[PDB]
Write a protein that binds this ligand. Structure first.
Ligand SMILES: [Mg+2]
Ligand SMILES: [Mg+2]
Ligand SMILES: [Mg+2]
Ligand SMILES: [Mg+2]
Ligand SMILES: [Mg+2]
Ligand SMILES: [Mg+2]
Ligand SMILES: [Mg+2]
Ligand SMILES: [Mg+2]
Ligand SMILES: [Mg+2]
Ligand SMILES: [Mg+2]
Ligand SMILES: [Mg+2]
Ligand SMILES: [Mg+2]
Ligand SMILES: [Mg+2]
Ligand SMILES: [Mg+2]
Ligand SMILES: [Mg+2]
Ligand SMILES: [Mg+2]
Ligand SMILES: [Mg+2]
Ligand SMILES: [Mg+2]
Ligand SMILES: [Mg+2]
Ligand SMILES: [Mg+2]
Ligand SMILES: [Mg+2]
Ligand SMILES: [Mg+2]
Ligand SMILES: [Mg+2]
Ligand SMILES: [Mg+2]
Ligand SMILES: [Mg+2]
Ligand SMILES: [Mg+2]
Ligand SMILES: [Mg+2]
Ligand SMILES: [Mg+2]
Ligand SMILES: [Zn+2]
Lengths: 275, 152, 139, 108, 155
RNA sequence: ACACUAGGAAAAAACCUUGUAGAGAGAGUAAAAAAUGAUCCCAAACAUAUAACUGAACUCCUCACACCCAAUUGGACCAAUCUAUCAUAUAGAAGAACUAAUGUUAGUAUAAGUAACAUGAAAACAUUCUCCUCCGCAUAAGCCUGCGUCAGAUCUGACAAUUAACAGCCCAAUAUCUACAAUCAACCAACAAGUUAUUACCCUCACUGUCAACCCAACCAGGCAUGCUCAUAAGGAAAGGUUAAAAAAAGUAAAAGGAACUCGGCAAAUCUUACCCCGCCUGUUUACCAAAAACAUCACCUCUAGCAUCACCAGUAUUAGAGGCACCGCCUCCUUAAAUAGGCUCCACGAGGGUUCAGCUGUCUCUUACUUUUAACCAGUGAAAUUGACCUGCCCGUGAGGCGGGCAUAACACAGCAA
RNA sequence: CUAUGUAGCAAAAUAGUGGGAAGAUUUAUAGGUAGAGGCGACAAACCUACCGAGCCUGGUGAUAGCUGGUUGUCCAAGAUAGA
RNA sequence: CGCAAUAGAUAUAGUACCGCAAGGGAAAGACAAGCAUAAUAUAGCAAGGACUAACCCCUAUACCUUCUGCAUAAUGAAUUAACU
């Protein structure tokens, strides 16, 4: 036996490290690991976002009916339903106003779809994990289910509104939710089917005959890797142009680009004005 | 090159080959069934057949007697050849021996073979029968038997 | 035995950890891992010079392709954009050629304009008025 | 001569595990349709053959016990009869080798 | 000297919920100190790698190599233990999930080789072999690769 | 200048350009392109769209700076261990750090599941058959329980054994003697010349070897004295199974020709002749590359020595020792068709050297068939030299699987060959 | 003398072909000669597998102007007159 | 401010074993290499720049020691662990 202690302890630490990569521990609430005091954490949550949350309302905006019921049952105060309702309703209205004013031509169906996307679980959970809402929120099951994160996040927005008024809440929503539209194309958030039908409907509403689909350019007609560039027309004037491999797909993409141009949601639109 | 050479090579030369086959054939005439390596039995089958052919000619012939003297080593068997085997096959004009393959030898994993003289007293080898005549394919073929016979 | 190295394991793993992704016996046998790891790091150091050289040659190739799309070789484009006092480098010229075709079309037009001005001036007799784009701006 | 370099585990694996060196799966095994034991098509049921060799050995032991010593190959046919089997009308003048167990069902 | 294999027959899983799919049982078994090389036992181990137990026994009964009967005895003991202890229903409802051969201990004179045989039987029927890569699959993956190209080394 | 960095001239230490070192997905330059004999030519091409562009670790740019020589020399840090004091730090100590010594010890690889090894046939396990041996039995010498039973395994333990008449282990003292061979021992013939009388004792069988498949060779086609059997009354088994490829080994057969092979008639088949050189002869020698023309040897000659009890020697000049030489007698142009080969006297002899006649033959012209072993496949057991790593191509050039320029190119066993 | 064998059956053997085989022959057994010594029908032949000088222990960690090696990190100065 | 099973005595032992002999003289007890799970796919000191992407593209003449530099001119290394 080599005499010594340092190498033995170093090897034990390395073994423990390896043993915490295979068989990692079951993840547990951050509010149970060491170094946790709720008061400091919630106050820091406030100050981090540059917002003067009222401490009591913010406190009750992170408590959920599930947690109250589990405390009542485990023992042998207010919940955040009302704040959640206020926050969700205001968020819907304010996002509608934002999108309507930024994109006037877009139809109400599309605006409602964008508003459902931004306030949906897929994006709200993402914005709520990366702002420490899951750490402070009280629930039963960890990780908190995405629906509970959504309702708690809008409860927090509701507290913010009841505390610092409408305009600051609007800035908050512009800062965290609207930003999520960055990069995304229109029809990655507004999921639709049969685009040519919608194009024909909108063109009819503007009293112009349905568009004629021509073939602008083509390469590799016979091969397995063709390229067809299909260009819609409206009485001898182009209104779109789409690529594809099949002529059907090229026509579909031409419809999609024409829809984007008419709804003012192009790739090179005037970028949102955050200042 | 070995085109058209019908005789195996075994033993320490031609003579030892004849002597090995002679011992196998003597064992066969004495017991009427022996288990031996497959290739050796396949070489000895022709000799056993022709031995019965020589034995049919009968004692009185001298050529057959000399041949059976050479090819039987314990001479008690020469009576048998001329009085139990050759008489037994007075009807058959060929194919006196049946040869089968059996599970390989335990020690050296050689290809084995049981060879016996047809008609002996011993318990019968488990020969493999063909499929029963009542199986589906056979029934359809029987229907074809009938329908072709009537047409012709 | 008075002193024996009690931690040779960690000194070995410091070198093997950089070789797990190698192929052969030279990803677990130290005597070979060391030599190939050292060659790896020497190439890693010496390769930054080639990185710069290669990206520059890729940019020159892309710019030559784009400029040939507009009937204008690469000597002309660079040797006559600078004569218009535009200090766009080659990285951004390549990016413009790929991602902003019409801006690059304009730059190529400008280069051809300046080239024509130069030919017309040199063809003339004396110091007739300079071309509308050939006028330098001083600091 | 002698090797000039060790051969790596990769080359050795491409040799040792090549298909030509693998053990082939046998496509000619089946079940004795009546007896119900495994067998290859062109070979005898091993269990049946063993149960036949046992009886052949017992018969031959009786034959040896009756012939006395060596050099006694009889000059007549032989018939073997199990318990409660009188010599049939066809087997007179043929040596009888008595056995003391009921005739096997497979002995016809 | 590490006796790990025979300790995987002791993992007690939690009682199943009435909803989740019935978990297929398992049995691990090993023969230690087989007087036989490992580079030869490997071929027999690989032969029976992906086939049910009964076909495996059939294939081994008629193979010539010395280790065939050792593998057969091991598989029979495994089947008996699986039915008797591990609460398997049908003794034919097993297949060779894992079969491998490993080195051994004993000493030299010229090494006297030894080897162990390790078998894992998983309840259920054999999984079907991976089908061949149809031409449409190749074209599909080639299109996928052609459709993931990005402009390399620029924005 | 190189042995220090970097870029060029194809690869390129030595020519041209360039140094002080880090990050950058910035920029400007340096040098730098041809004109008009032997495996397989060797970038592909191009006469005429404005001369500039390209091009480094040089320089500038944004940031950071001790962070590119051998031998040597200076300096700042430090892994691990022990001790003092804390109780990882400050100190003091020291067997204080291994990519390399055909390093040493242990493990496992590669060549490799390759080379090599083994069990006559049938059976009813009682037996029968085929074939082989200068072998077998005993004593001696050697060894020391080393195939007897039982019980455990694929060798471990227990139990049992080899019985003296054969062989060994010896002797009371003193004096006396003790001339002539052995050879079927008799004829001829030779030379190497081969115990008792007196005194003392009237005691009896103790002790040890006694086995076997055996000993010396690391385990073994080797070594091993004597008696008897002379082909066996005794003892054994040349083929694990198969197929009948090459190359290899041993053997058998061969048309016509019969040394044309080759250094040479080596090997094989046949059996004869003649000569020449050397050495007189038999013998001896380089255990393990030389058996001879060398050593020894009778015969001859030369030198020394006049003599006691440990050799020469229990000898004495015809003796003894040391040398040279080598009995004895005599003196001190042919060959072939063709040719560089062969052709002091002195019988006998030589696995000595050279030559020749005749024959013989697969030596050859010119190879062929079959058999056995090897072989290849199946099954068991299973090495060794060798090995920097290998993801292991060809041609031309440089000075070659790996550099350069062309060409070729899905992966993988198996058996051959030897550039 | 030839062929096989060359980690071979063998650290000099096997198969054939050969020389001697009543002698200066061959051989079992005990004893003797001991290392600058013995013995030698001289070949530098042999004296326990390797003798132009045995083998073992000691002086001995012989000596070696000759060969081979010489182990953490980082920086810096650093080369070819001559007797 | 001595070693802790390759150290400390050669030591569990001057035993086993080697040698005719003098004499020589051991070993050991309490997830390293190698393989399997899982053979490979044009191209080349087996890496680097990278890339959406493992290969494909561009760059790239193994290490030690000795000779003036050495394409491997030559010497040494199968590889791991311990001791040096
Ligand atoms: Mg540059
Ligand atoms: Mg500089
Ligand atoms: Mg420290
Ligand atoms: Mg040290
Ligand atoms: Mg070393
Ligand atoms: Mg080989
Ligand atoms: Mg072989
Ligand atoms: Mg006695
Ligand atoms: Mg006596
Ligand atoms: Mg005796
Ligand atoms: Mg006998
Ligand atoms: Mg044979
Ligand atoms: Mg044999
Ligand atoms: Mg064989
Ligand atoms: Mg002839
Ligand atoms: Mg002589
Ligand atoms: Mg002679
Ligand atoms: Mg084999
Ligand atoms: Mg060359
Ligand atoms: Mg090969
Ligand atoms: Mg020294
Ligand atoms: Mg000197
Ligand atoms: Mg310096
Ligand atoms: Mg020790
Ligand atoms: Mg020791
Ligand atoms: Mg490992
Ligand atoms: Mg080379
Ligand atoms: Mg070497
Ligand atoms: Zn059956």
């Amino acid at each position: 036996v080599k005499k010594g202690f340092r190498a033995a302890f170093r090897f034990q630490k390395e073994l423990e490290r390896q043993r915490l990569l295979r068989c990692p521990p079951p993840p547990v609430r951050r509010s149970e690991k060491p170094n946790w005091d709720y008061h400091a954490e919630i106050q820091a949550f406030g100050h981090r976002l540059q917002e003067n949350f009222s401490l009591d309302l913010l406190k009750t905006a992170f408590v959920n009916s599930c947690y109250i019921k589990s405390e009542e049952a485990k023992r042998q105060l207010k919940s955040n339903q009302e704040l959640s309702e206020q926050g969700t309703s205001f968020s819907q209205t304010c996002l509608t106003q934002f999108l309507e004013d930024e994109y006037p031509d877009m139809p109400t169906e599309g605006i409602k779809n964008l508003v459902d996307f931004l306030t949906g679980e897929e994006v709200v959970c993402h914005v709520a994990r990366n702002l420490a809402v899951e750490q402070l929120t009280l629930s039963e099951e960890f990780p908190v289910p995405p629906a509970v994160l959504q309702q708690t996040f809008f409860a927090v927005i509701g507290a913010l509104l009841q505390s610092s008024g409408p305009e600051r809440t609007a800035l908050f929503i512009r800062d965290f939710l609207i930003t999520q539209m960055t990069g995304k194309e229109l029809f990655e958030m507004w999921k639709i089917i049969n685009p040519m039908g919608l194009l024909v409907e909108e063109l009819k509403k503007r009293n112009v005959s349905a568009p004629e689909s021509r073939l602008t350019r083509q390469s590799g007609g016979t091969t397995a890797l063709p390229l067809y560039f299909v260009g819609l027309y409206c009485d001898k004037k182009l209104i779109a142009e789409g690529p594809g491999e099949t002529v059907l797909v090229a026509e579909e993409e031409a419809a999609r680009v024409a829809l984007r141009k008419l709804y003012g949601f192009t790739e090179n639109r005037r970028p949102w004005n955050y200042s | 090159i070995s085109h058209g050479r019908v005789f195996r090579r075994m033993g320490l030369g031609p003579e030892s080959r004849i002597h090995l086959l002679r011992n196998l054939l003597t064992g066969l005439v004495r017991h009427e069934r022996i288990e031996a390596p497959w290739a050796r039995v396949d070489e000895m089958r022709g000799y056993a057949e022709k031995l019965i052919d020589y034995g049919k000619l009968g004692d009185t012939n001298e050529r057959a007697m000399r041949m059976a003297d050479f090819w039987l080593t314990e001479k008690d068997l020469i009576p048998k050849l001329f009085q139990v085997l050759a008489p037994r096959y007075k009807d058959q004009t060929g194919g006196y021996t049946r040869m089968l393959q059996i599970p390989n030898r335990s020690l050296d994993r050689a290809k084995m073979a049981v060879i016996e003289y047809k008609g002996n007293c011993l318990p019968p080898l488990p020969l493999p029968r063909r499929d029963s005549h009542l199986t589906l394919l056979n029934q359809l073929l029987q229907g074809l038997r009938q329908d072709l016979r009537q047409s012709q | 035995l008075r002193n024996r190295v009690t931690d040779r394991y960690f000194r070995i793993q410091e070198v093997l950890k950089h070789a797990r992704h190698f192929r052969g016996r030279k990803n677990r046998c130290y005597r070979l891992a060391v030599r190939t790891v050292i060659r790896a790091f020497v190439k890693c150091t010496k390769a930054r010079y080639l990185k710069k050289k290669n990206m520059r040659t890729l940019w020159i190739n892309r710019i030559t392709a784009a400029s040939q799309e507009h009937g204008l070789k690469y000597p002309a484009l660079i040797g006559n954009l600078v004569k218009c006092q535009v200090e766009l480098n080659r990285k951004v010229l390549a990016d413009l050629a790929i991602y902003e075709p019409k801006t690059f079309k304009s730059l190529a037009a400008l280069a051809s304009r300046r080239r024509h001005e130069g030919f017309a001036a040199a063809l003339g007799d004396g110091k007739e008025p300079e071309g509308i784009f050939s006028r330098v701006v001083q600091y | 001569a002698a090797p000039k370099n060790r051969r790596t585990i990769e080359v050795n694996r491409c040799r040792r595990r090549n298909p030509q060196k693998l053990i082939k799966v046998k496509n000619n095994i089946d079940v004795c349709p009546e007896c119900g034991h495994l067998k290859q098509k062109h070979v005898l049921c091993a269990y049946c053959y063993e149960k036949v060799c046992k009886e052949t050995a017992e018969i031959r032991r009786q034959i040896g016990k009756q012939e006395g010593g060596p050099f006694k190959a009889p000059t007549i046919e032989t018939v073997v009869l199990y318990t409660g089997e009188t010599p049939s009308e066809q087997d007179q003048g043929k040596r009888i080798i008595e056995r003391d167990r009921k005739r096997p069902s497979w002995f016809t | 000297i590490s006796r790990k294999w025979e300790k995987k027959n002791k993992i007690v899983y939690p009682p199943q919920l009435p909803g989740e799919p019935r978990r297929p049982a398992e049995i691990y078994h090993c023969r230690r100190q087989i007087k036989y090389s490992k580079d030869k036992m490997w071929y027999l181990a690989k032969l029976i790698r992906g086939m049910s137990i009964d076909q495996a026994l059939a294939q081994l009964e008629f193979n010539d190599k010395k280790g065939a009967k050792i593998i057969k005895e091991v598989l029979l003991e495994a089947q008996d233990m699986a039915v008797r202890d591990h609460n398997v229903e049908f003794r034919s409802n097993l297949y060779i999930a894992e079969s491998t051969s490993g080195r051994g201990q004993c000493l030299k004179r010229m090494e006297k080789v030894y080897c162990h045989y390790f078998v894992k039987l998983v309840e259920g029927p054999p999984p079907p072999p991976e089908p061949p890569k149809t031409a449409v699959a190749h074209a599909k993956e080639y299109i996928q690769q052609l459709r993931s190209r990005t402009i390399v080394h620029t924005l």
